[PDB]
Symmetry: D3
Subunit: 218 residues, 6 copies
């Protein structure tokens, strides 16, 4: 019985940012406490995860402060490097609400859409011919109402944008003939810095997403 | 009584490519025969059009054969140059089906979406403050089943892509909270070269699109449609 | 008699910036008061205008504050989109005097030259074969002696540069085998903000430029 | 109790697990059990945990005009930050750099590998974390096959000689960076039928050999005691 | 008296391409036979030359075949590296006529203009304050009527373009308030390959350009002589 | 017997920056006092020099303050323009220690390596066929312990980097099969501004480098 391969593509939430005061520097959640790990455990031996979480990462836009943060710069290579996959999970959009990137929620949806499209056109080549995998686009929960004062200037108007993502993400996913899940339906941003997750929140999300995944793959 | 300004942003279909054999060179449809002109006539004195149709133009992707064909390179400037507008009409996607651009229909939808987004964030500045205008995204009709042999190699698998655009364009438009219309619902690509429109097709399209526009910009009529 | 098509390519002066205090925000001159409109009226039914005026637009240089302001990024597409034309009028150079763009008058001439060249090589293709249209390069008048305090820092040394443009523009136009007209010969920058035009100045310019056009086209 | 050591492997199709076949393409991925990185993992034991990033077609630090995703140096900074903290970075690249159309000398390819080592040394570019940067083991690939699949041969003209020259250059560059080196050509050769990729037998040998090398670097107290 | 420094910025004509059959490979003209050398000899001890001639070099446009051939990529650095200078001579434009670069003569003039402007804004900095030097723009002669068959495909329509350069170069130089000289007024492209110069042609050019230079840098004397 | 041609590619040290207080503006060392000139004199009539020294120039990295300062942008053209050569001397690396470029010594070595590689692949063409010339990579001496207060902010941590260059440069040169010389073995940065050389230091360096050159070329 073929082991099913799931690739998880996200930001610091998926890397395992431990929320702290002051907001930085952080250390990585122990493996046991990462949402992806709990996702893996609840799925069982039938499944095998590959995880790529980058602190600061956006859907598809350059961060003028750091040239390595554009998801869409990286994703084509990542997909080809982990082919073949049975599912691609995308949990991005939190960094896209940063003030200086000046994005609307629809713009952020388009960004997630750009990534879905990269998966659908995945590997760009005749060197292999496995099919492209389906995609589960996950909208993150709303930001915290109170963000660490060091980071707050960079998240002005961010909360309202983050609240609007589930609706947009769902339409975009649907338009692509792919799947959707709102992380805000089962958890919220409970980290002390108003942006990242506690281990308790990771656990809830991992277990919830595992149910959703089994529905799609059995 | 304020005159309503409508900006039309498209490709050769909107420039006025006269279909001919061989496919090139062409000459511009006389003004009287252009779809935008008939659109203007059917709208009346209540409306005033601005038209920007570029042969070869795509939604949001570079053509390696010509650096001036990317709609999204041009649109931000165009919008600011014609502010204030009451509506922006986009009729693009036909060139996006060209084989060498290697686009899926969903990708082309995202391209049209990129343009909608540019309109929604239109002018990027404090120099004026008019609101941004609403958008009517128009999907083109399917390509001809028979394309001029000179152009056919460049439109391989293009037909199927063009057939898939209305569904994608509608979702994208809806997702943006904007409007949609399928040109394929009232006309088809009847030009001899299998890509462009006759004057008869222009006339039909112009008249049909004018009805749609009035629905959006005359609120008494907009109201009546919810009934 | 063929109707003659004239394309006007300019900046906020051609859009119809209404001079006000404070300098921004502005509203667009009513159509009846725009210089291009008066140009059209004085030309008669023999002529038909197409107008493209963008606030902030330069000849051929990127504005680091706004990526849509480079005339030469736009002009090739615009020319092809309005083919066939009988004349192209260019009234640009006022924004090129902005301090942070660091341009000399000769440099600005070269920029206008770049645009003339784009018109001369206009459409780059076999898809149509109309000839390319002739060009009337119009130098703007000198800037106001007193510029709105909000904008003044951005126009340091700009006045002297603007005074030098007619001479340079004339040489460049002549070198290209094309025509020239100095807007400063018939009007000056009388707007309250020291940069833009009143409706009275628009009227004078429109009527003067119409005389010049008829000389070129009969 | 002892913290588990994290080793990141950054390579090309050799590291992805290209199964050599005729005709050369299309291929399928070596079963997990037969990948060199997997055997590397098994020979290391529970003391170690691998993260593997192998991309078919990938170069050290140069754009492939045929595919914009193949430049290792475009990807590596992000990858490093995404897998921090690491105890070692292994780089096994250079085989694609010998492709005719990229027009590279062996020294140039060394510089490319050097660019990657430098990215690791300056790894994460930020105050968001402060773990140290990890050491690097640069691995030179073996020489190409003398006979390359006719479909691919035009793109590997003069490639063999370049591949033979890589160990020398890679060693100097690694040494200059104060990092480690290993020549895959010292324990295996390109035995795949297409003249470019590896059989499962060759993967096994390489995995086991590289595991010895890794333990020398990360348990040096033990390595020391063993030598006498 | 300060010794006057003259910087010569050109292409293979200034490097010293020896015309041969077949066209390539060539070897460099002996120093004694280079036009710049004869220029130096005819100027005397009052002057000192610095020479930068690159085979294949254009005014201001990328050659898709070789990324090092754009004069304007190089000139800012070169100017600062040889500061202070009393004159900059530019003899470029021959490679700009190459078919695949698709340039008009006016465009090539603008390219030369771009270089003049770089000289006028020369060093961009506080680190020194010498004045910027004046410029003598030199138009090359027309291409040969017969070009080596290996190179001919790359110089289609090139002859006519090269004939048009003197007029354009003069206007552009004048517009910049700088000087002009037409190499075609005293020599032509007599090399066997139809592109480069013999030693005899170099000698003529060197001596002619030296007269022109002295006019510019000893202008009080030039003035007094004109009677 | 060939007259032997030596091309010297460097920064302000090779241009002839006269150290002064305040640090800027400077004037060029008289020709008689330049290190390259003394190099030429000590070599004799058997040799002929070509010199390209640009104030501010780096090995292979863009200076965000000035787009003309990247050695590797310039070197390919320079090499082809002065072919044929018998030797290329590179004395660069002092500007690479500037704080804002954020380079490690190994990175700077790689930069020098990039230049060596350009020389080894020199002219990229069939238009001539002379061989490529050998290369003598020269590491500069350590910076001054005391730098002009106006320039010091830009050379923080630069001293330590400059001290590390000889070791790195030697490895890189050796790896390329080329030659090396440490300018710090015969001189130090004795200019009043803590960065540039006096005429006395130029003389010492010129004479020392001439010995080295003769060893390589006979």
């Amino acid at each position: 019985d073929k082991i099913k391969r799931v690739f998880v593509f996200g930001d610091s939430l998926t890397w395992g940012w431990t929320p702290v005061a002051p907001i930085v520097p952080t250390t990585r959640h122990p493996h046991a406490d990462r949402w992806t790990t709990v996702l893996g455990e609840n799925l069982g031996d039938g499944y095998e995860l590959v995880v790529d979480g980058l602190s600061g990462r956006t859907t598809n836009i350059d961060d003028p402060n750091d040239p390595k943060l554009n998801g869409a710069d990286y994703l084509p290579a990542a997909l080809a490097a982990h082919e073949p996959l049975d599912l691609v999970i995308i949990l991005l959009g939190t960094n896209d609400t940063k003030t200086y990137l000046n994005r609307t929620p629809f713009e952020i949806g388009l960004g997630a859409g750009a990534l879905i499209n990269m998966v659908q056109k995945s590997p760009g080549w005749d060197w292999t011919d496995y099919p492209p995998p389906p995609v589960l686009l996950i909208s993150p929960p709303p930001l915290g109402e109170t963000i660490d004062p060091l980071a707050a200037p960079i998240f002005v108007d961010g909360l309202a944008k983050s609240e609007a993502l589930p609706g947009v993400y769902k339409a975009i996913a649907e338009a692509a003939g792919e799947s959707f899940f709102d992380a805000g339906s089962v958890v919220s941003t409970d980290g002390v810095d108003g942006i990242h997750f506690t281990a308790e929140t990771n656990r809830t999300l991992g277990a919830a997403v595992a149910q959703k995944v089994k529905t799609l793959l059995q």
